[PDB]
Amino acid sequence: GIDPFTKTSLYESTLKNQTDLLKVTQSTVEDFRSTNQSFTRALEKDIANLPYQSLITEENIINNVGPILKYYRHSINALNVYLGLNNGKVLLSQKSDAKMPELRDDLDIKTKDWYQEALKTNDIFVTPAYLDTVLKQYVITYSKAIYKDGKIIGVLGVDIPSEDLQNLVAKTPGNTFLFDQKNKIFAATNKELLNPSIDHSPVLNAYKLNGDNNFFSYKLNNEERLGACTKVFAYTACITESADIINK
Ligand SMILES: CC(C)[C@H](N)C(=O)O
Incomplete structure (x- = not known):
């Protein structure tokens, strides 16, 4: 008019x-970000509340932390939920045939920003979207250095498909x-x-x-x-x- x-x-x-x-x-x-942050924080707390004994051998990490990664992965339908260790291995719970979490030595984790950057902040780190090497989908990763009594256990990672946010x-x-x-x-x-x-x-x-x-x-x-x-x-x-x- x-x-x-x-x-x-x-x-x-x-x-x-x-x-x-x-x-x-x-x-x-x-809300997408904060839901994923809260989830990551909860997982950090459950891992760190394990006794040291459960955390300080690789077999114990597999048996005691693996189930926690799996349940948490299922609860939110994440693509991958994992814990990277300073020896370069990563305990990985991945989508797809119900096989137990495995300790993988071939993922070059010290080269990855999700690993590196988590050790440079006390917050959760959130990556840009990138192509996950494991399942070959674009993901946003939430990572968090997990400490117990001041002592680093490893770097937690959570991969959520970027398509979830796009959708x-x-x-x-x-x-x-x-x-x-x-x-x-x-x-x-x-x-x-x-x-x-x-x-x-x-x-x-x-x-x-x-x-x-x-x-x-x-x-x-x-x-x-x-x-x-x-x-x-x-x-x-x-x-x-x-x-x-x-x-x-
Ligand atoms: C280690 C893997 C699960 C992670 N998404 C990466 O590509 O580095």
């Missing part, structure tokens, strides 16, 4: 709407999407946005000028669109819509 009063009413309404929906996608990402984001209302820490498209409600040749520089450029949660105007094929983005951990969450709501 031409009258500026009416246009402003449309603009303020749609800003609120789109900001709400962006928030839902932000919350989705947050949760896709389900949300609104034309929302998520870029990874290299500004590559990661997840979207509209699956077309995942074409790697799509040009996201208008939205990313507008975000760069405007900042988190600040609604902007931009152009596509000479038509006006409206959007907003915000940082959510190392991701960028955005929403966009046509400006026809305000212009027409």
Whole structure:
């Protein structure tokens, strides 16, 4: 509508709407992370509460920690749950034919960021998505150095398929999407946005000028669109819509 009063009413309404929906996608990402963190923390506590005797031989680690890894893996349908040791071995509970957790020596764990970085923080470390070597799926890893009496036991890892987060984001209302820490498209409600040749520089450029949660105007094929983005951990969450709501 031409009258500026009416246009402003449309603009303020749609800003609120789109900001709400962006928030839902932000919350989705947050809740995914915090659920996985809480799970990892719980597992750390159960391992560290074992007596040392149960932790200080490899056979005892297999027999006493293995079942805990397995139950926890099942409870959340994780892809892998594991404990890496300073001798380079990793006690691995992996999806797929119910075979018992095994101590693997061939996974080059001291070269891995999930291992290395866990020893450099007292927090849980969360990797970018990457191709798991074991099961050959893209995963987000949550890792945690486990200490008992101050003494390192090993580095706990939990691999959750990145597709789980992609699927949760896709389900949300609104034309929302998520870029990874290299500004590559990661997840979207509209699956077309995942074409790697799509040009996201208008939205990313507008975000760069405007900042988190600040609604902007931009152009596509000479038509006006409206959007907003915000940082959510190392991701960028955005929403966009046509400006026809305000212009027409
Ligand atoms: C060790 C394995 C389970 C881990 N996902 C990795 O690829 O390093």
